[PDB]
Design a protein around this ligand. Sequence first.
Ligand SMILES: *[C@@H]1O[C@H](CO)[C@@H](O[C@@H]2O[C@H](CO)[C@@H](O[C@@H]3O[C@H](CO)[C@@H](O)[C@H](O)[C@@H]3O)[C@H](O)[C@H]2NC(C)=O)[C@H](O)[C@H]1NC(C)=O
Ligand SMILES: *[C@@H]1O[C@H](CO)[C@@H](O[C@@H]2O[C@H](CO)[C@@H](O)[C@H](O)[C@H]2NC(C)=O)[C@H](O)[C@H]1NC(C)=O
Ligand SMILES: *[C@@H]1O[C@H](CO)[C@@H](O)[C@H](O)[C@H]1NC(C)=O
Ligand SMILES: *[C@@H]1O[C@H](CO)[C@@H](O)[C@H](O)[C@H]1NC(C)=O
Ligand SMILES: *[C@@H]1O[C@H](CO)[C@@H](O)[C@H](O)[C@H]1NC(C)=O
Lengths: 537, 122, 122, 132
Amino acid sequence: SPIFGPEEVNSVEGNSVSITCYYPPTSVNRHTRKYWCRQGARGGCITLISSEGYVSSKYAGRANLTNFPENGTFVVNIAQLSQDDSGRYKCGLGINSRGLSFDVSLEVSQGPGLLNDTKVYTVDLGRTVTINCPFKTENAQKRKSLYKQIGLYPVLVIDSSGYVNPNYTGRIRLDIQGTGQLLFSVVINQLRLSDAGQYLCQAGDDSNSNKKNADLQVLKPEPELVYEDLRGSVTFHCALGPEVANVAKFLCRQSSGENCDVVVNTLGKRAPAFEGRILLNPQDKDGSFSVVITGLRKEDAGRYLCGAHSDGQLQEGSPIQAWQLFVNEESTIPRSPTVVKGVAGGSVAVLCPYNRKESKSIKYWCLWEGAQNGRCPLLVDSEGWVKAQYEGRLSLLEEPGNGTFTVILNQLTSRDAGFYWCLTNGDTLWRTTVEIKIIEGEPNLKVPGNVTAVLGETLKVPCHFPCKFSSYEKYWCKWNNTGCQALPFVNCDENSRLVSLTLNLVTRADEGWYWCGVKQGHFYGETAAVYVAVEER
Amino acid sequence: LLPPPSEELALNELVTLTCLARGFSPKDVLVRWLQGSQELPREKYLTWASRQEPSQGTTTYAVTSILRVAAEDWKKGETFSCMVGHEALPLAFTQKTIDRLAGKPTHINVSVVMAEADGTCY
Amino acid sequence: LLPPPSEELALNELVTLTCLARGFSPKDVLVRWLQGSQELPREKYLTWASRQEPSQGTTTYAVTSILRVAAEDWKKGETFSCMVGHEALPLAFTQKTIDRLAGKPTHINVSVVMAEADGTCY
Amino acid sequence: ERIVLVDNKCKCARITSRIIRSSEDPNEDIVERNIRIIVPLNNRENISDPTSPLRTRFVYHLSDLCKKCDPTEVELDNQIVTATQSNICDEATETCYTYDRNKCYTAVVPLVYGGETKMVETALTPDACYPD
Ligand SMILES: *[C@@H]1O[C@H](CO)[C@@H](O[C@@H]2O[C@H](CO)[C@@H](O[C@@H]3O[C@H](CO)[C@@H](O)[C@H](O)[C@@H]3O)[C@H](O)[C@H]2NC(C)=O)[C@H](O)[C@H]1NC(C)=O
Ligand SMILES: *[C@@H]1O[C@H](CO)[C@@H](O[C@@H]2O[C@H](CO)[C@@H](O)[C@H](O)[C@H]2NC(C)=O)[C@H](O)[C@H]1NC(C)=O
Ligand SMILES: *[C@@H]1O[C@H](CO)[C@@H](O)[C@H](O)[C@H]1NC(C)=O
Ligand SMILES: *[C@@H]1O[C@H](CO)[C@@H](O)[C@H](O)[C@H]1NC(C)=O
Ligand SMILES: *[C@@H]1O[C@H](CO)[C@@H](O)[C@H](O)[C@H]1NC(C)=O
């Protein structure tokens, strides 16, 4: 069930193949036995090659199997394929009679032999192709017909003077570089899946009904395998060519009854189920862009298609890419609160988890705008840069450490509601999102407004707390760009209130912001904030 | 009249029963208990007052009661009854009865899969 | 670790147990026997050398050993154990155990009891 | 066979359930419950080597399989409080019938090295006991 690979695999005789299977990287799963077995009929599921050194008699000289523990993948190569190797197979871990497997289907087709009197062209679904047809030195004043044997009718639906089909309209031309020599040509724009088959070309006729064949193959794209887990994130890379760099591109998800459903557009569409947790980036000089989706749920798994059109929908005759996604759900990403509530004037504190062996990185904090496309302006980083309008009410702290860091945002308003992202500079990124709702009530801690100061004398500021915070620790701060650390000047005099602050000569170095807080040693809590100016007389 | 919780049943002590009446219009009611046909004396059970319930306009009232019996009397097959008297009932009384085999299942399948066929999945 | 053959149990004088190790890549290995939970002296069993087995891919090795014990201790219910130490094992040793009830059993007794199948699982 | 209630790996027992919205009488429907027991025929009673012979009796109490005693978090008013979830978890101490793929099981054996003896440690399940 956590095991994933390519569902269907095709090749021809004599060729090779390479199959990859994925597993969770836990230490039991790296050291256990890996196997490739052929699930035939009549009970058993006989093994063909294994990880401990077993190679069967039929696979001698043809195959091997390599385990890569840091990827969590293992690869199987099989050379010199035949037509007796078509059947249903299985990847796996451990003992065959349990079910830690994945089903793979493999079909091998018969190749070409002794019918090679055609010049074939292969082309991607939704691109251009040419069909060359040698004009000769007498057959100019006839019809230059082109049949396609629907059944065995000669179906002329293309003529080289405009006598065309309403089916094949709007995309067929000819261009003249003939008049005596041995070529003319026809360019076919925006091919479909429907336009396959064998073409009996001609260019004029000398009456023996002499025939020329020029067949084409149109192929649908191969999906790339992506392996992610619950509460993680994914990126797709949509890398169509520079020919369509001025078209509106998109990304659907395939459903059961041949139905893409649009997740994003370039003209400003979105599903409601992806609000707060999707990005789309501006495309480069090559016309290549990326789509980021965070907070992966269980039902996100399936086939995805990225394409291009004038409107932003899956229409036939458009170039596509593909992917197949698997959500693991035996994850090791720690769970977290998704919603965090607060009241106007109060504080919040959210915990953001990263990977433990990537602790030497730099940390960031977003704000998902979501207006046009999806966008993360930064608000604060671990280097010591904060935004302009978030001055005095934002900080990022590296406690509790070891899996987690902490960011504190107070002086809340009703317009601070939104979705927020936490980022690192590590190798593979989890991006976790949290929603801040603003509810009604009043703050727990209570401080006055903004204080003045006379020309050089003692200041004193109080800060209240209820008896639910009596079990906890009390502190102050002075806020600067690198966070805040506590002061030695406080009294914490009264047994259930009034943790004070004394500044016994007002210099210019105190004119900033100060905080009043609550912590259980490592975990942080509520916060208030005040400013202290200094006036003239 | 509600059956006992299974957690209480799997401990071999006293098990508890619950009676409930709701939706009646004047707040005057009588609740009595029975075991088989014998009325139990009213020092063996606890019954609350009769309060009104949140609803849509038409004011109505509710009442509960409990009774704890021994597990051997329950497991042998002795039945119990809750009986309710009101003025708007045409015959002025109502009965309910409970014992074992009340919510007993209707179908049970047992399959013993032998060796040489072990084919479970993850 | 293999049980004794069937025809040695009738003559009731001594029995023999076999310990086979298979499929390991360097040719260095150790074999030690226990009775119950006490190590036996080295001069009571016989171990051969490690040799290379026929190839099904990568080259691997194998080794054997036998131990002869009294036929009364096999029928009391004493247990014997075989230990193999190798360079590639996790904690450098591993073991297997056998006694009279496990191996050519001639009898399989198993009794499964399920208590409360209809029981409000929360 | 739709929703998992219990997936226990000390006893290797699994309980699922599904509302089967049956065809006939389409305004009533049944509740099905599936239980799966896998019984090992070669394990001991205690998981050490010479304990007692192979286990021949296996007992399953569904009031113990459905038990829930780890504390949870509940938002009552505008608060986070911690609560328990069961009436009976006055206390590992349970006996396990099978192993578990994600846990080591070791032993200690004394062997001789010419002079004294040692306290050599032995892995009983070799896949799960690499130091990593
Ligand atoms: C099931 O078997 C295990 C394994 O034998 C039992 O655990 C072990 O019990 C012994 C005796 O109680 C412990 O030995 C003690 O060692 C300490 C030194 O650490 C020493 O101070 C004592 O005098 C005694 O020698 C041993 O530590 C313990 N644990 C292991 C091996 O991990 C277990 O009690 C058995 N359980 C049942 C229910 O039978
Ligand atoms: C993880 O998988 C990648 C495949 O994307 C491996 O990359 C290839 O590794 C082989 C070595 O066997 C090289 O010959 C190839 O050049 C690599 N690149 C590609 C694009 O195929 C990678 O080796 C795996 N990870 C580890 C740690 O081995
Ligand atoms: C064995 O594996 C290697 C990978 O290093 C691969 O290049 C080679 O083709 C394989 N041999 C076969 C398939 O015979
Ligand atoms: C980090 O977390 C792990 C797992 O909780 C713990 O074993 C380790 O000691 C922690 N490190 C520190 C420095 O606290
Ligand atoms: C605090 O009061 C001073 C006094 O002029 C003012 O300049 C400052 O903007 C005030 N800050 C807030 C957050 O109200």
